[PDB]
Amino acid sequence: AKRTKKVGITGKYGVRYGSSLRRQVKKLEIQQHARYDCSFCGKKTVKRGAAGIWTCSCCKKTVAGGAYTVSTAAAATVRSTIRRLREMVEA
């Protein structure tokens, strides 16, 4: 079954620490311990280790990225800015 009513992973912390801090940890540990799609081989096998480093388990690709997720929102627009700023040189 679903053995917690709401807490989920932060149930490893138990009783302590507040509730707002534990939910703020829940929101980031779902993203942190998730299994992401690989941008190169297409197999949903990118985990992380050593925050900032996202290795694909097969395929040996080792993409750098955000600490708690692969592409943080304040970076995924940056490349779009770069996608905007590479077009002005030619067309």
């Binding site: 801090l21 940890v25 980031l28 942190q32 900032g52 708690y68 304040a74 940056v78 770069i82």
Partner: peptide, 17 residues
């Protein structure tokens, strides 16, 4: 060097203990 630096969003998480 072009681009933001990886490891971002680092201080979003609470440092519980």
């Amino acid at each position: 060097v072009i681009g933001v630096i990886a490891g971002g969003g680092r201080v979003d998480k609470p440092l519980l203990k």
